[PDB]
Amino acid sequence: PQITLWQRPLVTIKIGGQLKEALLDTGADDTVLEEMSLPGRWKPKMIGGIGGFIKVRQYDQILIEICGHKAIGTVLVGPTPVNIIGRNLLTQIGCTLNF
Amino acid sequence: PQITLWQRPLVTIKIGGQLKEALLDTGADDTVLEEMSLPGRWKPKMIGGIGGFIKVRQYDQILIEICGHKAIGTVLVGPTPVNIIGRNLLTQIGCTLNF
Ligand SMILES: NC(=O)c1ccc(S(=O)(=O)N(Cc2ccc(C(F)(F)F)cc2)[C@H]2CNC[C@@H]2N(Cc2ccc(C(F)(F)F)cc2)S(=O)(=O)c2ccc(C(N)=O)cc2)cc1
Ligand SMILES: [Cl-]
Ligand SMILES: [Cl-]
């Protein structure tokens, strides 16, 4: 796809067999999803946002599909304003910025 | 240009006679810069995300040069940890997401 930015770049993802809406956010280093259940063990992670640093749960090697493109990578789970697909998975699906 | 997301998409901008480094951020609705002086009227606003909200000053119809591209729009000013170019100005330089 070519996605313009006149509206928020909201796309459908699939994780855990479920469809969700998520934002493609080139300013996010990481992928951060709203509270959900994921398999396996998690590790602690601190992330810095606009308002401060917060604790999230880090899950590694998770299957996730983004606009139909398959990815397997790290997913953080915590109190985020919206599901965010950040650069760790945008790089996997081959996303670039162009102007 | 075609900008990779292996690293943060950092570029040089010029605003108010100052050269600054800023993040091209598709998850930000509006542009947010670190504390600086700008001309004209402003109004307060709150913006938020992980970690909570911050108060910013909203200036409209500001000129910014981004990679040689001149773009006019709203700039929010406040205690952001990084200078952010948001969608409101990315559209003006014809920036898209591509995968
Ligand atoms: N309403 C607006 O005009 C607006 C709202 C929020 C922001 S933002 O400043 O929160 N922002 C830019 C930003 C902030 C901080 C960083 C830092 F990592 F360097 F600290 C980098 C970039 C947001 C857009 N890109 C990321 C950042 N966050 C996500 C976010 C917030 C609010 C919205 C919403 F839809 F509600 F408006 C969407 C997206 S963040 O701050 O929550 C964040 C999240 C994850 C990570 C990470 N490491 O993966 C980092 C930061 C900008 C404009
Ligand atoms: Cl990853
Ligand atoms: Cl366009």
Closest CA to B38 of B60, B16, B71, B21: B16
A26 shares contact with chain B (CB less than 8 Å): yes
Q: Is the Cβ pair A2, B96 closer than 8 Å? A: yes
The amino acid present at A62, given as its one-letter code, is I
Q: How far is CA B26 from CA A44, A60, B36, B37, B89, in A?
A: 27, 25, 23, 25, 10
Sorted by where each starts, the structural domains of chain B and their CATH numbers stand as 1-99 (2.40.70.10)
Spell out which residues of chain B touch residue A99, defining contact as CB-CB under 8 Å. 1, 67, 69, 90, 93-96
> Exposure of A13 by Cβ count < 10 A (0-12 exposed, 13-18 middle, 19+ buried)?
buried
B47/A97 Cβ within 8 A: no
| Chain B positions in Cβ-Cβ contact with residue A97 (cut-off 8 Å) | 2-3, 5, 9, 24, 26, 95-98
Distances (CA, A) of B84 to A62, B31, B36: 29, 5, 14
- Pairwise CA distance, residues A75 & A84, whole Å: 10
